[PDB]
XYZ file of C-alpha atoms in Angstrom:
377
model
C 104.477 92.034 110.983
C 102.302 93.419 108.172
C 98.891 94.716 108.952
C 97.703 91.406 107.328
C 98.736 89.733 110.723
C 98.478 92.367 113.160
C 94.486 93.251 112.052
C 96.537 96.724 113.525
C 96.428 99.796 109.784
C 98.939 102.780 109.997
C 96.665 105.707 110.385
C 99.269 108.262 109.073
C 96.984 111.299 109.032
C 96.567 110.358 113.163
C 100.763 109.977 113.315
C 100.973 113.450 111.648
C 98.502 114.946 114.520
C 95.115 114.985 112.877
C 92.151 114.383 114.658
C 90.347 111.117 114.192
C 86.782 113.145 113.400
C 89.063 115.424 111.440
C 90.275 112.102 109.443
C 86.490 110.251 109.004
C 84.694 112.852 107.964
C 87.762 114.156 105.438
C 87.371 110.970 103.977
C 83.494 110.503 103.907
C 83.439 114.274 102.193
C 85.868 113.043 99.421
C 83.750 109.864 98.825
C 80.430 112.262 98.842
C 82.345 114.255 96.318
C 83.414 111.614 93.992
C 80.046 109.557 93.591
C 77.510 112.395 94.249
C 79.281 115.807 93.865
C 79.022 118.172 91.388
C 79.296 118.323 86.932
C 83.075 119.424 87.906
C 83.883 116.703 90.650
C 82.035 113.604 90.235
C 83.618 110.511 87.886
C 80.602 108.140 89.214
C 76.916 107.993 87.571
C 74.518 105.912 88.053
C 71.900 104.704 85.284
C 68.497 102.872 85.925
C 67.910 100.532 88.952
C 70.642 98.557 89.048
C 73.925 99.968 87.084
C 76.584 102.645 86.938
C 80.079 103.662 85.204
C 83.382 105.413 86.519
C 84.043 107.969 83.588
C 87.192 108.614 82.560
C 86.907 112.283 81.669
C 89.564 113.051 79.453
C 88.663 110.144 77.540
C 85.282 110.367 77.345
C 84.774 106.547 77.720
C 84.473 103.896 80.774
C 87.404 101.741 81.184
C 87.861 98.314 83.183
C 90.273 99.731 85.207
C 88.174 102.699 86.401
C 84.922 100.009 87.033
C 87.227 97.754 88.945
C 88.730 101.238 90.903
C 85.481 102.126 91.404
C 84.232 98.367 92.678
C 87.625 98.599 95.160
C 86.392 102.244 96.648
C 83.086 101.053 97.345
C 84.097 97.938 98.914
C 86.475 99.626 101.569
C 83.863 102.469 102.197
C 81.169 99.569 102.511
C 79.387 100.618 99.947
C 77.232 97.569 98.364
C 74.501 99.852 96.061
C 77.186 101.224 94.198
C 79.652 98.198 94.054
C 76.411 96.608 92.543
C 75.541 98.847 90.236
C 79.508 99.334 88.918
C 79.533 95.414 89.384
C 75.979 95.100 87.209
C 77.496 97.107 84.361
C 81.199 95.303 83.913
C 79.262 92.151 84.133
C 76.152 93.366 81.504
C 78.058 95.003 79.250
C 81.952 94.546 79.490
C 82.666 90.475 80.056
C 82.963 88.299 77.069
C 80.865 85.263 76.910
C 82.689 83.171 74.077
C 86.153 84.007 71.534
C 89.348 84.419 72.976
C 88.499 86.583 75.267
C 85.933 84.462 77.348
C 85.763 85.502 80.607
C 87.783 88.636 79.949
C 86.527 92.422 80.377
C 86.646 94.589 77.729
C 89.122 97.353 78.564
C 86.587 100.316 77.303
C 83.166 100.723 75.982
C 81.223 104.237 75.407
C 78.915 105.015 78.557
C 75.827 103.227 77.125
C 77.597 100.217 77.187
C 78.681 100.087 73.304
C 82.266 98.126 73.224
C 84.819 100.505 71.667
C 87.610 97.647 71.676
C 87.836 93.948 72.725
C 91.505 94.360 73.653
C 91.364 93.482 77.319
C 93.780 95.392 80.376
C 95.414 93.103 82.994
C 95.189 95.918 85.347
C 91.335 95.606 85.232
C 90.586 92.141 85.930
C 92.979 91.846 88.797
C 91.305 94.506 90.123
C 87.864 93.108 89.390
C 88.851 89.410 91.601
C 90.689 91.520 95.207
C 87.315 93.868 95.133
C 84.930 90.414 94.310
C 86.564 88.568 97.141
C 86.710 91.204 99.414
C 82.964 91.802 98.696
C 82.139 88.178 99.531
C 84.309 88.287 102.800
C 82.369 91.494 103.721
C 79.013 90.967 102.851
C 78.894 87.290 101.246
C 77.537 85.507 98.286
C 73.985 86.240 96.587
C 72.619 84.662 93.467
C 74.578 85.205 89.848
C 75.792 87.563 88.997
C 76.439 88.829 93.121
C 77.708 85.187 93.496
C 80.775 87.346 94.298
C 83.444 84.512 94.996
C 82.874 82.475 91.975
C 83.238 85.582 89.879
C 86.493 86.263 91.198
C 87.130 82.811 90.925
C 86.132 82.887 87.402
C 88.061 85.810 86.503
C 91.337 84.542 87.451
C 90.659 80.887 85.500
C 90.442 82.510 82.703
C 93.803 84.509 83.852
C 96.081 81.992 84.239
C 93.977 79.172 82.058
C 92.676 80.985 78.630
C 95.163 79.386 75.989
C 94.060 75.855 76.962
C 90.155 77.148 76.577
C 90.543 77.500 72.767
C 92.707 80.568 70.803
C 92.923 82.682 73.122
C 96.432 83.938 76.025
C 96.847 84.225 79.554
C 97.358 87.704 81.153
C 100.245 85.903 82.840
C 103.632 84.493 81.488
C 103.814 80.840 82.677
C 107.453 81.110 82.190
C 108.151 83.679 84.812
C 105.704 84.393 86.547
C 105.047 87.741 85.912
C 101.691 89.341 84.502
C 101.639 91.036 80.706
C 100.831 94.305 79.486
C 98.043 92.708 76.792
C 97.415 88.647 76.774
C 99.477 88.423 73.162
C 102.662 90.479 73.513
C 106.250 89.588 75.526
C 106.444 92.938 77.897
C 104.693 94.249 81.043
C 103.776 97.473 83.071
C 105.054 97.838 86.416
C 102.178 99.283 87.771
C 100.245 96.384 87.293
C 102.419 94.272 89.114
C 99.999 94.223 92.401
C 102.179 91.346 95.185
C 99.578 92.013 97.922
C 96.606 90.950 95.821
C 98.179 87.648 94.239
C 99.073 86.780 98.257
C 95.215 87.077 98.853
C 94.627 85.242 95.235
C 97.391 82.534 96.901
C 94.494 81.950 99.656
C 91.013 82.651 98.013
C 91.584 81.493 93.842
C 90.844 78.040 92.941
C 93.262 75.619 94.409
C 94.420 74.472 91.261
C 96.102 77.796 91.281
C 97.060 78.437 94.676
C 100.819 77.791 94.583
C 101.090 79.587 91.148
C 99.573 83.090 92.959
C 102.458 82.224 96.027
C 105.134 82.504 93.214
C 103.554 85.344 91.240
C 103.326 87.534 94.591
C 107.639 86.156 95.004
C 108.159 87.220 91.803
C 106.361 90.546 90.980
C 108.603 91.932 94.546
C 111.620 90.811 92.356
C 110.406 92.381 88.978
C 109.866 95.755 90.693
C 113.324 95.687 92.103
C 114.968 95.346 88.665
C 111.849 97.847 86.918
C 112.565 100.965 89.365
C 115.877 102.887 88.842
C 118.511 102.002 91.850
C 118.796 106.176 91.698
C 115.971 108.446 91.719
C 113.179 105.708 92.395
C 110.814 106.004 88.829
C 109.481 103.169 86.756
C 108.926 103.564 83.212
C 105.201 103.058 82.034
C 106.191 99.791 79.891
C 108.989 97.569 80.641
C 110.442 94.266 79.492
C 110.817 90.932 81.778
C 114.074 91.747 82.810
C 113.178 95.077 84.083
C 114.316 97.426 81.583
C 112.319 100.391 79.592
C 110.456 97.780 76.914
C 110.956 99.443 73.355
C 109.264 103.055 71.513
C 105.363 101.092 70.617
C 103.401 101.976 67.878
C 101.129 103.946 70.209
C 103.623 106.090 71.648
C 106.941 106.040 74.030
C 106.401 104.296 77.571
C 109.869 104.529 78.582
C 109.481 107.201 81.155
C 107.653 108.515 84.271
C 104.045 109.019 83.144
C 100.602 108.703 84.570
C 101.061 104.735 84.250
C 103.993 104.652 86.634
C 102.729 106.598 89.264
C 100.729 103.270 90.925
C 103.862 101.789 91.123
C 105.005 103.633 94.560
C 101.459 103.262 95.872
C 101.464 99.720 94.831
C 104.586 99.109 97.042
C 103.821 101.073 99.978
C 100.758 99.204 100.362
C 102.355 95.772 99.707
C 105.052 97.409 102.500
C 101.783 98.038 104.668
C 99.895 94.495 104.495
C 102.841 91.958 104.629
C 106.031 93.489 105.573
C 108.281 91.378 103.302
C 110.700 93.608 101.608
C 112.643 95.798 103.455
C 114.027 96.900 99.255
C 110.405 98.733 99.616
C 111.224 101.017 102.173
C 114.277 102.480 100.522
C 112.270 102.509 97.176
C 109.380 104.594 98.812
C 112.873 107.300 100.768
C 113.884 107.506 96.669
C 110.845 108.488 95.301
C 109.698 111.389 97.769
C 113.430 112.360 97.783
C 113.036 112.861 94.197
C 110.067 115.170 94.234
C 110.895 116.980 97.395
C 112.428 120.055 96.346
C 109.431 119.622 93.191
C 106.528 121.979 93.150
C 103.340 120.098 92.211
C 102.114 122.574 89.386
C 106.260 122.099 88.092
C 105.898 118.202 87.677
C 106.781 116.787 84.935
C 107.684 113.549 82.450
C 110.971 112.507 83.288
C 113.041 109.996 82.214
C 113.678 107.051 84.547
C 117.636 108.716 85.192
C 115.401 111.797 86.585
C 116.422 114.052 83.250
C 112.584 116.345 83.071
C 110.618 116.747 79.928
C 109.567 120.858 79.081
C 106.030 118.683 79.044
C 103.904 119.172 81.838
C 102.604 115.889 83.684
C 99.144 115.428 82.669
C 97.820 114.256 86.272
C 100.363 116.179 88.957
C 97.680 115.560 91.712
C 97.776 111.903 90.812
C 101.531 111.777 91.424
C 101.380 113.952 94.419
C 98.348 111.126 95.757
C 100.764 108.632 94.986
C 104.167 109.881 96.152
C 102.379 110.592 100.042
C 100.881 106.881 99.950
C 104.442 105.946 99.070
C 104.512 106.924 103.682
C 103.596 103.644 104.482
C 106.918 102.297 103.496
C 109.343 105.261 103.440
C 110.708 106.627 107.157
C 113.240 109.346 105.875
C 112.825 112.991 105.921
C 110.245 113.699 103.810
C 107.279 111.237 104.616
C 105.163 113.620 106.980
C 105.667 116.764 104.744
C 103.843 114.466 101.574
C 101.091 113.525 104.158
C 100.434 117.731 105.058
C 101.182 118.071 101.464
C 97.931 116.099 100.882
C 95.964 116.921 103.330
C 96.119 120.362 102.247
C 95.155 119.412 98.266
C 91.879 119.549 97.184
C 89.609 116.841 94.563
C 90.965 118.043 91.175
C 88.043 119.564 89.021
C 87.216 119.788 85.328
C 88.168 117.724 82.306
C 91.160 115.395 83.689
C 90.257 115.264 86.685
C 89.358 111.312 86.538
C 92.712 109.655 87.013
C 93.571 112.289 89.388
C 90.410 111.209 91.604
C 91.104 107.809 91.667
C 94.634 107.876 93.008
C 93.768 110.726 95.496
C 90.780 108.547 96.796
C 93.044 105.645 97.066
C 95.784 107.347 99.208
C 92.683 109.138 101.466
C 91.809 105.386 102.072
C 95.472 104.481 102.687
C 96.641 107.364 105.015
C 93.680 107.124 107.291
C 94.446 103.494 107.694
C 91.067 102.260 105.870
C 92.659 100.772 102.699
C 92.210 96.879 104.419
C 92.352 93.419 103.499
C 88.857 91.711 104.026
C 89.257 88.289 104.674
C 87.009 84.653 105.854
């Protein structure tokens, strides 16, 4: 039984032989370090009473997906000043109030609040509902906008629901199932495909739209069968329904292993972790740290999804590492406790990219010590 039943979380650090003080205070240095560390370190900031940003560093800017990370870290730390300031912020300055994006966040605004783009990210509002319910389950409802569960609620309306509203798309194909890389266009992202959080949508979303989260949870553990190569275990960044590499975009080629498809083996493991119900998961999470075994971290790469390597460099290799020893809560072949040393022994990244890198790392410290929980009542 998954961990959802039991109430019981794999501490892997603890099945590798660390000591439990060893484990919380490892893990309550790398929070300290991320939210009030140094220039070099941190990627949270708070401004005036009642707000703050995650920065994405490279990018200069604040993007829904790093407010909705950041809302997630803080809820499984029990952190409810920061979650409310990060909370505050997406709210104030990133939800739309009317158009066709009611509801919706913007997916990145400068750090004063100034919307860059309107385009939404999928990845960000799912995000945004699993860290607003888990918030109300933990600490409960306060008035608008800390009316946690409604928000959630809200959210995922307008997921399922915004073509009806007016002009606007859901962030889910009715057809399938399956949840879209933007609201108007026919493909998806694998790593966005998040089973465990529509089961916990299947139980806390409006019940209008219970049984539609049961299917989408059914039918994301499919997609990711036919989007990860039988072989050597990648996703690309961008695929089509079916599974395959979607085509070259405008924007640039997502048909390979890049920063994108790195949550995918993560996203598994931790499905693996909560509700045992593909065993396909296991073997996935074997592939994948069979693949970079024999792979220094400093070599990584791109790499096509056949495992061919790019001369380019990958452009977050402690992000990968992060997510190829979470990828231990599934796999149970020979390489699962060297990825867990492996990452106990690497340090926060520092400096200019270090963002992306933080946020994975942080997730898989959460993970591995067994503290990466579903909240529930």
């Amino acid at each position: 039984k998954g961990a959802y039943d039991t109430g019981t979380y794999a501490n892997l650090f603890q099945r590798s032989g660390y000591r439990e003080d060893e484990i919380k205070a490892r893990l309550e240095q790398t929070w300290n370090d991320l939210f009030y560390g140094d220039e070099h370190t941190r990627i949270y900031y708070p401004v005036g009473d009642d707000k703050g940003y995650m920065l994405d560093t490279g990018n200069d800017d604040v993007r829904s997906a790093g407010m909705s990370y950041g809302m997630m870290m803080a809820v499984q730390m029990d952190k409810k000043h920061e979650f409310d300031r990060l909370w505050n912020y997406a709210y104030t300055y990133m939800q739309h109030t009317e158009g066709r994006y009611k509801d919706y966040f913007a997916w990145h605004c400068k750090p004063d609040g100034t919307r860059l783009s309107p385009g939404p990210a999928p990845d960000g509002e799912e995000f945004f509902a699993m860290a607003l319910f888990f918030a109300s389950n933990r600490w409960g409802d306060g008035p608008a906008p800390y009316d946690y569960q409604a928000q959630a609620r809200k959210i995922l309306h307008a997921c399922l629901h915004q073509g009806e509203q007016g002009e606007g798309d859901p962030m889910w194909e009715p057809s399938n199932r399956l949840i879209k890389f933007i609201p108007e266009l026919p493909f998806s992202d694998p790593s966005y495909h998040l089973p465990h959080f529509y089961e916990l949508f299947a139980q806390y979303a409006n019940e209008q739209d219970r049984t539609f989260w049961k299917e989408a949870a059914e039918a994301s553990r499919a997609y990711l069968r036919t989007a990860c190569h039988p072989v050597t275990g990648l996703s690309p960044e961008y695929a089509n329904y079916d599974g395959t590499p979607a085509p070259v975009q405008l924007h640039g080629d997502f048909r390979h292993f890049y920063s994108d498809a790195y949550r995918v083996a993560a996203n598994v493991a931790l499905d693996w972790e909560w509700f045992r119900k593909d065993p396909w998961q296991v073997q996935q999470s074997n592939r994948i740290q069979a693949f970079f075994s024999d792979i220094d971290v400093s070599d990584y790469r791109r790499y096509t999804i056949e495992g061919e390597p790019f001369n380019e460099p990958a452009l977050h290799p402690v992000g990968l590492l992060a997510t190829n020893a979470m990828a231990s809560l599934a796999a149970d072949g020979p390489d699962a406790d060297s990825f867990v040393k492996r990452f106990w022994n690497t340090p926060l990244r520092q400096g200019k990219r270090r963002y992306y890198d933080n946020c994975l790392y942080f997730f898989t410290m959460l993970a591995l010590s067994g503290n990466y929980r579903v909240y529930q009542q």
